[PDB]
Design a protein around this ligand. Structure first.
Ligand code: A1AAW
Ligand code: GDP
Ligand code: MG
Lengths: 214, 167, 219
């Protein structure tokens, strides 16, 4: 990137927040600044153009400024509606091209804790006539996005062959989800009494169990 | 290289789209999508001075917002269009004129009156009625057809000369 | 308003050439506007590729200038991109956009396409297997497992051809140690309906041209 932005910002509901973007005489110095907003999984959207003007449908909470080779964006009456990525953009006379900032993730503090739901599926009968066995653990709807997943054959840990996702992207105070897969041979399936998927989220642990002939 | 900004207004179905494409691209379009609103640019020579024309073709539906009033205010002169075989399109001319002054803060604005579809024999508006209305408003009147390209250049160029007497 | 829709192949082997097309509707390619290509590497900021104007003038990003070509087709209302000598660093989502109006300036990117994803890799395009996750107190859950497929991103799952759309959740894929992906999709339904309904999942992977319908039913 050629313009510089701070990687993150945050605030509590109702307070004011400010984001900044810095450049050089060939770009933010000479030309106008434009601001874009992006919600995770969609194309960007215009927000402020020509330093401080709002297009149709942008509330009065958003205002923008330019001073020297620096720019600023202010937001007031913060709400969950606002959790998004933000980018500054300008033209550069030394390169003859548009340049972007780095982006800045805004985060809203004080969202309440929510605990995970857990669902566990046994191997389907087809996978066993094709010589395979996968167990699926599906983990959903927890807010603080940090989860650890352990598996336990009978009572002893079994950490070979365990795949697990990263946390999801998040916006509009939406909840997170994740999933984990354990791979077995067909003989290992029949030879054990039980298996568990065990999910720890800030000490609170949730456990589900399945067995052959369940 | 001066620049001029022109707007075409008039009731649905009178020929706003067809007139513009004639000027820009020199061919005729038998029907065109009535929802599409677009802007075009061309370089021309009028009386020896070279200049760029921007042309806004209007469409969509009737709506009044604070942004549309800025999109329209940008225009420097306007072409009121009616069709010679459509009497209701001729009465609407008054409505369009008053909206234009509401966003231009003035009584004096460059305008020209255009009577389109002169290739069709079934006139329902005679030529005298149009001259009397134009003389009341104090503006020129032009008859055109976009199926044969008769009068197209003249109409647009007259507007440009209007914009020059102003300044 | 103007509508923009991009299309292209989801996977490319190096050192081939990437090709993309954007089709325009609700407006004319011959209006006073500039048409742009922009990309976003996964989890990183945006980058601008280049511009074209309807009369054939072009600007390119100085860092890519020797590999990029953009073109306009007047007869179909389209414009396109080619990028030679691709390498793994070119994996990104690609967008087509319109802006820089000569009437009233709002900036460079007034309207955006929905985007498309391109993966550059030497690996080979395996198609998925599909297995039913059979259901087993007011509600139950059931799903489809999509297993061991490569080229992660042009994959789609829907239920009952679109006639069922409430309570459907589709999780992110996991990259397994073998280098092949897995995916799961699940729906929840009133437990009484299990005796008098039919649930079918429809997977569509385009890079292998795989289409599969699997009926899921109580064990
Ligand atoms: C067939 C669709 C079509 O061609 N339309 C064009 C005319 N539209 C329309 N109908 C009635 N009134 C208006 C007013 C305005 C207008 C004007 C003339 C000045 C300023 C202004 N600010 N906001 C709107 C306007 C317009 C542009 C169009 C009108 C119907 C659709
Ligand atoms: N005979 C004739 N028909 C015309 C002329 N100009 C336009 N038309 C037709 O009138 C119809 C409406 O014109 P159009 O450009 O779509 O009007 P718009 O609604 O203002 O965009 C079209 O079917 C055209 O074919 C003309 O000069 N002569
Ligand atoms: Mg029209």
């Amino acid at each position: 990137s050629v313009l510089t932005q701070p990687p993150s910002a945050s605030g509590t509901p109702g307070q004011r927040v400010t984001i900044s973007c810095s450049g050089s005489s060939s770009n933010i110095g000479s030309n106008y600044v434009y601001w874009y907003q992006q919600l995770c999984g969609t194309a960007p959207k215009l927000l402020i153009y020509r330093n401080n003007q709002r297009p149709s449908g942008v509330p009065d909470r958003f205002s923008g400024s330019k001073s020297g080779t620096s720019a600023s964006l202010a937001i007031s009456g913060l709400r969950c509606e606002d959790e998004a990525d933000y980018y500054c953009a300008a033209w550069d006379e030394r390169l003859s091209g548009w340049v972007f900032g780095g982006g800045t993730k805004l985060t809203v503090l004080g969202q309440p804790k929510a605990a995970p739901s857990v669902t566990l599926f046994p191997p389907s009968s087809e996978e066993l006539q094709a010589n395979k066995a996968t167990l699926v653990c599906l983990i959903s709807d927890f807010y603080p996005g940090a989860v650890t997943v352990a598996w336990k054959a009978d009572s002893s840990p079994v950490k070979a062959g365990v795949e697990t996702t990263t946390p999801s992207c998040q916006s509009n105070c939406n909840k997170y989800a994740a999933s984990s897969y354990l791979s077995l041979t067909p003989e290992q399936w029949k030879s054990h009494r039980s298996y568990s998927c065990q999910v720890t989220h800030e000490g609170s642990t949730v456990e589900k169990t399945v067995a052959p002939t369940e | 290289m001066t620049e001029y900004k022109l707007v075409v207004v008039g009731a649905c179905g009178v020929g706003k789209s067809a007139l513009t494409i004639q000027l820009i691209q020199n061919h005729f379009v038998d029907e065109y999508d009535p929802t599409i609103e677009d802007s075009y640019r061309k370089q021309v020579v009028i009386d020896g001075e070279t200049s760029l024309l921007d042309i806004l073709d209007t469409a969509g539906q009737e709506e009044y917002s604070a942004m549309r009033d800025q999109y329209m205010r940008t225009g420097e002169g306007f072409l009121l269009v009616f069709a010679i075989n459509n009497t209701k399109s001729f009465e609407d001319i008054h409505h369009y004129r008053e909206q234009i002054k509401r966003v231009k803060d003035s009584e004096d604005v460059p305008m020209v009156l255009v009577g389109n579809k002169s290739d069709l024999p079934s006139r329902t508006v005679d030529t005298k009625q149009a001259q009397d209305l134009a003389r009341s408003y104090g503006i020129p009147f032009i008859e055109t057809s976009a199926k044969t390209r008769q009068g197209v250049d003249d109409a647009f160029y007259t507007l440009v000369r209007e914009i020059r007497k102003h300044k | 308003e103007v509508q923009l829709q991009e299309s292209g192949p989801g996977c490319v082997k190096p050192p081939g050439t990437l090709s993309l097309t954007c089709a325009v509707s609700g407006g004319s390619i011959s209006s006073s506007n500039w048409w742009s290509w922009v990309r976003q590497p996964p989890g990183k900021g945006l980058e601008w590729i280049g511009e074209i104007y309807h009369s054939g003038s072009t600007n390119y990003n100085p860092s890519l200038k020797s590999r990029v070509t953009i073109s306009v087709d007047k007869s179909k209302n389209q414009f396109s991109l080619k990028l030679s000598s691709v390498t793994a660093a070119d994996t990104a989502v690609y967008y087509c956009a319109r802006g820089s109006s000569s009437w009233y300036d709002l900036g460079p990117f007034d309207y955006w396409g929905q985007g498309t994803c391109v993966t550059v890799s030497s690996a080979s395009t395996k198609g998925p297997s599909v297995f039913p996750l059979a259901p087993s107190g007011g509600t139950a859950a059931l799903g489809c497992l999509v297993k061991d497929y490569f080229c992660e991103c042009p994959v789609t799952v829907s239920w009952n051809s679109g006639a069922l759309t409430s309570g459907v959740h589709t999780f992110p894929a996991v990259l397994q140690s073998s280098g092949l992906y897995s995916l799961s999709s699940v729906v929840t339904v009133p437990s009484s309906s299990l005796g008098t309904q039919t649930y079918i999942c429809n997977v569509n992977h385009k890079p292998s041209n795989t289409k599969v319908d699997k009926k899921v039913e109580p064990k």
